[PDB]
Amino acid sequence: KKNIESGVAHIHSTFNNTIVMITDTHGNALAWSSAGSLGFKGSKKSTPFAAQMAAEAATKVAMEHGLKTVDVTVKGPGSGREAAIRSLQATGLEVTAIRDVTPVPHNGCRPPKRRRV
RNA sequence: AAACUGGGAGACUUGAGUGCAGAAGAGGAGAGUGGAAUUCCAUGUGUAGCGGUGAAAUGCGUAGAUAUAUGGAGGAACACCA
């Protein structure tokens, strides 16, 4: 439907999870996934393999509506950010841009206590 | 008695200040202003999780969360320079 054939992948990868949503060239979302929505639990949600299969479960649906063009904007200073890409290309999509979008404050707000573990 | 310390009348320019000619600086007080980010709000797309740990649970979520796009509101601190 809508035979968009263009869009941009958003990767949001923290220390203990990983989300990949694929939306079109502007806003409105088409298909998403995350490691939790694949039965994984707890620790394992941060290994790259989780990002592998989540990228797959998103692509497989995004190209069930016609899609080649995609870019990659990676938030999320975590680990599996590149495994997400390697699964994004090698199951059909047409990656052509990588960019980093990490919020960097110019010293505005105060962060929480340091943990004494 | 008259070297030294004290007192009295003077004299001097090296200490101390003044004039003239220049230099650097997150020194202080007042009044405006900028962008990055966090929170909340409004609206579109959007399906079942998100968040968190050494592992879990409490918490938020099908009164449509998280994500994602555009617009507003307020406060505090000023990345690189260093």
Numbering used by the authors: 13 to 129
Task: Provide excerpts from the study.
Ribosomes are the ribonucleoprotein machines responsible for protein synthesis. Here, our goal was to investigate the structural conservation of the Enterococcus faecalis ribosome compared to Escherichia coli, a model organism for structure-based development of ribosome-targeting compounds.
In the 16S rRNA, larger structural variations are located in solvent-exposed and peripheral sections of the beak (rRNA helix h33a), the spur (h6) and the body (h7, h10 and h44). Gentamicin binds near A1492–A1493 in the 16S helix 44, restricting motions in the ribosomal decoding centre, which contributes to misreading and interferes with translocation and ribosome recycling.
